[PDB]
Amino acid sequence: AAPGKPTIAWGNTKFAIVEVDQAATAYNNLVKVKNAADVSVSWNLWNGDAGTTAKILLNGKEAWSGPSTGSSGTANFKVNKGGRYQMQVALCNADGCTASDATEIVVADTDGSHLPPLKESLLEKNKPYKQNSGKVVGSYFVEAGVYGRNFTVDKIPAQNLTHLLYGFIPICGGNGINDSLKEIEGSFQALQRSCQGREDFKISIHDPFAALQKAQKGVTAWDDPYKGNFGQLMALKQAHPDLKILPSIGGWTLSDPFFFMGDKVKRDRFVGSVKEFLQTWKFFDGVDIDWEFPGGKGANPNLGSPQDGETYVLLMKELRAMLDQLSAETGRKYELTSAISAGKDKIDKVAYNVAQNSMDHIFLMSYDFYGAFDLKNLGHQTALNAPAWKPDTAYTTVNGVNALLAQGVKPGKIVVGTAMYGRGWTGVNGYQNNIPFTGTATGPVKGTWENGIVDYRQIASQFMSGEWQYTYDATAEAPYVFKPSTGDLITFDDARSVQAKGKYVLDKQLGGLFSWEIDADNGDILNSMNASLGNSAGVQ
């Protein structure tokens, strides 16, 4: 007759195709990619015949077989695909097979295929929206935001976005390569730690702990292979397959290395590391280049050259080729985008009309036009048009867009940016006609986390009452609050301004909208971004 029903023995049931050392500090010791996971299963049989053949079934599909030589046994086999499988041990003989009860084994992989959907409820003022406008709706999630700001991936209103850019991927490099970091507490030191033993100009992860080791909703088990933001983003892709999650390389303090990319030897090394990166972390849909201004004028005052414009176009070209190479190997489609300055002076230092042919989207940083970094010339930090008191204002959203359109850039590539934060000055004075922007400041305004910057959340919750004056400049399409006694002036985006930009995007037939760090919003900004772009409400 058929064999007796076997029983699965005690033993770890979680494995991974891509192993991650939950204790490593160096990127080169953090991950090791394997073509398949090494699984092992043992069983017992206290009653009945042991059969002649033993098989390991994964979801009913045979994954291993071998002679059944005793009432007990062990099977070692490979699993080349991630997922949660119902594993069974079956004993078989001439007349019949007998399977044991199912035991779940997890075979982890960086695409999150082993994780249950991370479908969290919208928080704060966030309201549901369907991405049915065909327009881009993106936002940035900062890696470091999981600390003080305590804003994790599970707090992201993922259903109200089409693109999600990661809080910046660094480029390895010490003195002379990433000096701009030295200005931030232990940041430079952190990067050297991650890049220990790694060639300079290669991609890396800035905060390994926050990225893959910190426990977070959905990935809290002490023995889960991928935790932190990455782990969560993997689960997030399971819930929102169509969501494009893109790693942004660069940023204000990590753009320094780009200025060396003129040397193709380094550029090739960079493009190669990015590819290996995309192969390693499958949840990512491409790459975002945030070279904080080619030509200088960035965080580092000693970098920038006329050669930068050409380098940028070359970089995008080579990256696009690399992604194409990758598509041929995975069959997937990858997006290539970039965040650029909205100022015409910087936009002209690059031939975007040519680079656009390799890029999917161009995220126009139409914000930070003004700020505490200049106490003499004040203005709207993210306005749409020039104000009435200075119609010849240079830094405005429209000018930025026009500059691009002028070069020959297709409007569909342009994604206008909105701010979920405000910039402000303190002790403003010497203004006339009651327009604070015409005076000068004595210093930066007290910020939420750092001087001169305040989350929209704090603006809407603390500076929308009391002695604060609220004003919406209809000419420029931008709001601002002012406290006469202390001279505190704050410029930011609000539902109305964002709505103005949305209709503007709809009119000029631009790509869409995106915002700087989703952690600073309470929902008003993103809600408006969606509504103004045509997305229908109600959960889908």
Swiss-Prot record:
The keyword Nucleotide-binding does not apply. Keywords: Carbohydrate metabolism, Chitin degradation, Glycosidase, Hydrolase, Polysaccharide degradation, Signal. GO terms for biological process: chitin catabolic process; polysaccharide catabolic process. It is an enzyme of class 3 (hydrolase). Pfam families: ChitinaseA_N, Glyco_hydro_18. SUPFAM superfamilies: (Trans)glycosidases (SSF51445), Chitinase insertion domain (SSF54556), E set domains (SSF81296). It catalyses: Random endo-hydrolysis of N-acetyl-beta-D-glucosaminide (1->4)-beta-linkages in chitin and chitodextrins. One of its GO terms (molecular function) is chitin binding. Residues 135-536 form the GH18 domain. Its EC number is 3.2.1.14. The keyword Hydrolase applies. The active site is at residue 292. Belongs to the glycosyl hydrolase 18 family. Chitinase class II subfamily. This is Chitinase A. It comes from Serratia marcescens.
